[PDB]
Write an enzyme that holds these catalytic residues in place. Structure first.
Site, PDB file in Angstrom:
ATOM      1  N   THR A  28       0.906  -0.989  -0.231  1.00 21.20           N
ATOM      2  CA  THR A  28       0.456  -0.261   0.187  1.00 21.20           C
ATOM      3  C   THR A  28       0.847   1.094  -0.022  1.00 21.20           C
ATOM      4  O   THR A  28       1.564   1.412   1.147  1.00 21.20           O
ATOM      5  CB  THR A  28      -0.666   0.293   1.495  1.00 21.20           C
ATOM      6  OG1 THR A  28      -0.304  -0.588   2.073  1.00 21.20           O
ATOM      7  CG2 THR A  28      -2.132  -1.021   1.179  1.00 21.20           C
ATOM      8  N   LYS A 128       5.363  -9.199   3.513  1.00 23.26           N
ATOM      9  CA  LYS A 128       3.833  -8.274   3.373  1.00 23.26           C
ATOM     10  C   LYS A 128       2.887  -9.580   2.533  1.00 23.26           C
ATOM     11  O   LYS A 128       2.582  -8.797   1.502  1.00 23.26           O
ATOM     12  CB  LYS A 128       4.031  -6.862   2.615  1.00 23.26           C
ATOM     13  CG  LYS A 128       2.399  -6.303   2.934  1.00 23.26           C
ATOM     14  CD  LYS A 128       2.847  -4.469   2.807  1.00 23.26           C
ATOM     15  CE  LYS A 128       2.318  -3.770   3.232  1.00 23.26           C
ATOM     16  NZ  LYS A 128       2.247  -4.441   4.666  1.00 23.26           N
ATOM     17  N   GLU A 161       5.749  -6.068  16.443  1.00 24.65           N
ATOM     18  CA  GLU A 161       4.808  -4.453  16.188  1.00 24.65           C
ATOM     19  C   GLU A 161       3.693  -4.052  16.402  1.00 24.65           C
ATOM     20  O   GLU A 161       3.272  -3.857  18.050  1.00 24.65           O
ATOM     21  CB  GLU A 161       5.009  -4.647  14.525  1.00 24.65           C
ATOM     22  CG  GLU A 161       4.417  -5.867  14.390  1.00 24.65           C
ATOM     23  CD  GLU A 161       3.863  -5.542  12.739  1.00 24.65           C
ATOM     24  OE1 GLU A 161       3.277  -4.895  12.351  1.00 24.65           O
ATOM     25  OE2 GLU A 161       4.611  -6.589  11.689  1.00 24.65           O
TER      26      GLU A 161
HETATM   27  C1  LIG Z   1       1.651  -2.736   5.419  1.00 20.12           C
HETATM   28  C2  LIG Z   1       2.583  -3.239   7.150  1.00 20.12           C
HETATM   29  C3  LIG Z   1       3.020  -2.755   7.922  1.00 20.12           C
HETATM   30  C4  LIG Z   1       3.435  -1.560   7.142  1.00 20.12           C
HETATM   31  O1  LIG Z   1       4.215  -1.567   6.193  1.00 20.12           O
HETATM   32  P1  LIG Z   1       5.357  -0.274   5.567  1.00 20.12           P
HETATM   33  O2  LIG Z   1       5.393  -1.149   4.321  1.00 20.12           O
HETATM   34  O3  LIG Z   1       5.856   0.462   6.298  1.00 20.12           O
HETATM   35  O4  LIG Z   1       3.702   0.303   4.357  1.00 20.12           O
HETATM   36  C5  LIG Z   1       3.115  -2.732   9.382  1.00 20.12           C
HETATM   37  N1  LIG Z   1       2.599  -3.923   9.688  1.00 20.12           N
HETATM   38  C6  LIG Z   1       1.715  -4.500   9.115  1.00 20.12           C
HETATM   39  C7  LIG Z   1       1.210  -6.393   9.524  1.00 20.12           C
HETATM   40  C8  LIG Z   1       1.697  -4.188   7.451  1.00 20.12           C
HETATM   41  O5  LIG Z   1       1.134  -5.408   6.611  1.00 20.12           O
END
Ligand SMILES: *Cc1c(COP(=O)(O)O)cnc(C)c1O
EC number: 4.1.3.38
Length: 254
Positions: A28, A128, A161
């Site tokens: 995204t 991701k 996270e």
């Molecule tokens: C997409 C995502 C993030 C952040 O990703 P960025 O590439 O830095 O936008 C963090 N945690 C999860 C679970 C995600 O899916």
């Protein structure tokens, strides 16, 4: 409005493995003034996700152009990209599957400890990918509280996270971030902040820390491609005073 495989499509074949097993990945991105921020980073994170999930594709040049044209149209918003292994394959087998599918679409702080712990799997860490059911559950519990984001732990108790963002916390001149080798997504904004902090005067360390260790920080900062950085006021029953690091990287991140 979805652009799938080079042309506008509203629907996708049911037999697609993204639908069957969430077999793929996505990104995204932030669109500002007709431009995709960190475009190169988004394409490179898609290639590594495809590399570890064994999805073979060579449409990178074509995909890049499409993200750029869609961003020029939208002007200001969010650009989502999904890549799946496509239709085919006998059961969970990848054999005789393909070709890969590409889907594009454009659209116009307190932490609460999450009761949902992330599973540990080195083979899926950092990526991701589309299996984001853990994030759906975390979000559901998060909404039962009055927090804006959640502090998420590993199945072993290690701070990993948030629900949809990465975490940084610091004491003094040392900045910390959880190693994402067993769980979590290695965000694009996370990696960008690491690059800034590396060349900067702050010290940066990638640790494996318990909850209590991270709750002794002077400050906490949340990040992702869309915020892109957010200052944290509290994490449950622990308040934070300074926003120095946040004031540092924020202008550099936007
Ligand atoms: C997409 C995502 C993030 C952040 O990703 P960025 O590439 O830095 O936008 C963090 N945690 C999860 C679970 C995600 O899916």
């Amino acid at each position: 409005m979805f652009l799938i495989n080079g042309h506008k499509q509203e629907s996708l074949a049911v037999s697609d493995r993204a639908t069957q097993f969430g077999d793929g990945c996505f990104t995204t991105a932030r669109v500002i003034d007709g431009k995709v921020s960190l475009l190169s980073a988004h394409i490179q994170r898609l290639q590594d996700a495809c590399q570890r999930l064994m999805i073979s594709c060579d449409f990178w040049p074509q995909l890049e152009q499409e993200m750029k044209t869609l961003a020029a149209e939208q002007q200001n918003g969010v650009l989502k990209v999904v890549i799946s292994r496509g239709s085919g394959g006998r059961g969970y087998s990848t054999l005789n599957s393909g070709p890969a599918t590409r889907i594009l679409s454009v659209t116009a702080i307190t932490l609460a400890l999450s009761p949902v712990r992330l599973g540990r799997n080195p083979h899926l860490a950092g990526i991701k990918h589309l299996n984001r059911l853990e994030q759906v559950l975390i979000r559901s519990h998060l909404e039962q509280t009055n927090a804006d984001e959640a502090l998420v732990l590993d199945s072993e108790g290690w701070v990993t996270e948030c629900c949809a963002a990465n975490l940084f916390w610091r004491k003094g001149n040392v900045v910390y971030t959880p190693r994402l080798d067993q769980a979590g997504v290695n965000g694009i904004m996370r990696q960008f902040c690491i690059r800034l902090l590396a060349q900067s005067s702050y010290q940066l360390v990638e640790v494996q820390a318990s909850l209590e260790e991270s709750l002794q920080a002077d400050e906490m900062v949340i990040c992702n491609a869309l915020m892109p950085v957010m200052p944290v006021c509290a994490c449950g029953d622990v308040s934070f005073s300074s926003a120095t690091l946040y004031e540092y990287l924020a202008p550099l991140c936007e």
